């Protein structure tokens, strides 16, 4: 269920368990044929809660399910990699382009990862390739960056909603470590497939990569943290995995009530809605596109620089038609309007 809709009715659906102490668990994964993101977690619940593949209505949303027996609120992210999201983005308007189409879902995946990494006791990454996904790492680095510039505004909303003095667990955090967040989540990763030598190796890699992107061992600037001794990496078989999660979950006594978690999901909707962001922010690729086209246009105007106005006007068009990939039709129309203007004066 979409977390935005989950809040509106959660107060009454669990009216009897508003004082129950729970954990919030985030889930990062990709859909595959006959295997959805949360197939291992719904298998932990022994109840097929999450789908094999997210439908169009479920794309770019956090899907929440509260297990009453386990006292856990699971958060599964429907990200940019879902087949239904790529279909939706590239079909909404073919008069746009690939970059501006995917960009919007990319931003929402940053917002939703930001949502999880400030509100989950643990986050588990499911990966099937056997190599650590660096595209995810690059995403988390952009998440951590956005977090640092919106922590001050988000912290104001934790104060306004009356959650800032609510403990998330037994750990204490300084004002700088806790600004804008409710916890520094403990990150786990499960890989789908002498077994002990491979886990220790991937544990070293995992930590090394996380350090290399400045995601751990950075004090208040860290995005997450890793256990000190309890396993962080797990190798799923082609129940060992239940023990992997229980050793993690049972290392922390439940503290925060479901009532405060509900208010927290309500409070943090401004993160998903982007109400605290500066209007009109573009991704790195969009700014790259816009910069090279601004240069391509500035150079094409350099070429045009009396009777042979069509002569010098046409050579510029041949340039813009040679180098501009996206918005080429609008680029050609815009320049020749510029050339005809100069061709009058």
């Amino acid at each position: 269920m979409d977390i935005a809709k989950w809040v509106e009715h959660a107060r009454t659906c669990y009216s009897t368990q508003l004082d129950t102490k729970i954990k919030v668990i985030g889930v990062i994964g990709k859909d595959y044929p006959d295997h959805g993101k949360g197939d291992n977690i719904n298998c932990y619940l022994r109840e097929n809660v999450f789908p094999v593949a997210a439908t169009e209505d479920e794309t770019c949303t956090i899907r929440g399910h509260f297990s009453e027996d386990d006292q856990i609120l699971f958060l599964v992210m429907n990200g940019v990699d879902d087949v239904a999201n790529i279909r939706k983005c590239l079909k909404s308007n073919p008069k746009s382009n690939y970059f501006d189409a995917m960009a919007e879902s990319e931003c929402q995946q940053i917002r939703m990862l930001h949502f999880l990494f400030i509100s989950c006791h643990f986050i588990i990454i499911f990966e099937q390739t056997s190599r650590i996904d660096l595209e995810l790492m690059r995403f988390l680095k952009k998440v951590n960056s956005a977090r640092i510039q919106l922590r001050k505004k988000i912290n104001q909303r934790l104060v306004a909603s009356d959650l800032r003095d609510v403990s998330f667990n037994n750990r204490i955090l300084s004002s700088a470590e806790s600004e804008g967040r409710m916890v520094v989540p403990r990150l786990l990763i499960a890989f789908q497939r002498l077994y002990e030598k491979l886990e220790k190796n991937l544990d070293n890699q995992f930590s090394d990569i996380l350090k290399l992107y400045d995601l751990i061992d950075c004090g208040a600037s860290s995005l997450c943290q890793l256990n000190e001794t309890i396993p962080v990496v797990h190798l799923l078989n082609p129940n060992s995995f239940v023990k992997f999660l229980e050793d993690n979950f049972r290392s922390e006594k439940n503290e925060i009530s479901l009532e405060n978690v509900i208010e927290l999901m309500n409070c943090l909707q401004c993160v998903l809605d982007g109400d605290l962001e500066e209007k009109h922010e573009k991704t790195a690729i969009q700014t790259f596109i816009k910069r090279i086209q601004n240069d391509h246009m500035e150079e094409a105007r350099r070429l045009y620089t009396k009777e042979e106005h069509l002569m010098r006007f046409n050579e510029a068009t041949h340039y813009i038609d040679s180098v501009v990939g996206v918005n080429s039709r609008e680029a050609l129309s815009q320049l020749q309007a510029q050339c005809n203007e100069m061709w009058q004066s």
């Binding site: 279909r87 746009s96 690729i285 240069d295």
Partner: protein, 260 residues
Amino acid sequence: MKESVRFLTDFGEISDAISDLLTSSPNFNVISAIGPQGAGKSTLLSMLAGNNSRQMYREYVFRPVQTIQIDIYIVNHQIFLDCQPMYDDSTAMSDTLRLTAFLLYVSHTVLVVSETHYDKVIIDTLRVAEQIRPYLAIFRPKLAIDRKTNLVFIKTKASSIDLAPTVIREREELLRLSFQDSRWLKVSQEPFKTLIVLEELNEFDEQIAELREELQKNREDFTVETAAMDEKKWLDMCREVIRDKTLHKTLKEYQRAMTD
């Protein structure tokens, strides 16, 4: 030619030894291969180059062992380019993109070999590389400006469910959507010709022979005139792309956009 040779020398310059290996016919075909390290494109590309099923690994034409490198191999006017796999994180993106943009411009068809199709990051790399363009309007023979390079995505080391026609159709649709607005790239609109899936004797090579034949179909010449460019003039084009200043300027603005 017995085995592959390095297409570049130090600092990404074309090796001095390539021009002597090129004949003078206008009938030549350029196929490049790109992708991550594990997919095994080097062995696959060689199969298409000439190798024949159970031939000793020592006899393979592309055997991987300088910052950037491409391997060159030619039989019967058929040019095969084996790019180094894809990967400071910032410099690795800039180098991978530089080689990708170069091979898109100089190839008739580029094989995109991976174990993870559909892969958005791979698709992101291709459509960004598309925008890294030179300006060779003074080049003679005049070059096709609206030319589109053919892409054939190959999912290797695949599982049984990757062979399901329903899964290939779902993934091929995404691939066709990823290039519907592309100007200089294209994918086949025919089912099962955009995404090729292989698992891992004689039955295997029959596909390589059939695939090898299909890679001669959807080509678009670099020249405006039919048969106007010789394969040695193709090597001259390759030197002019790597030298073009507008291409260099756009690469740098990309490197800046990634660090910023």
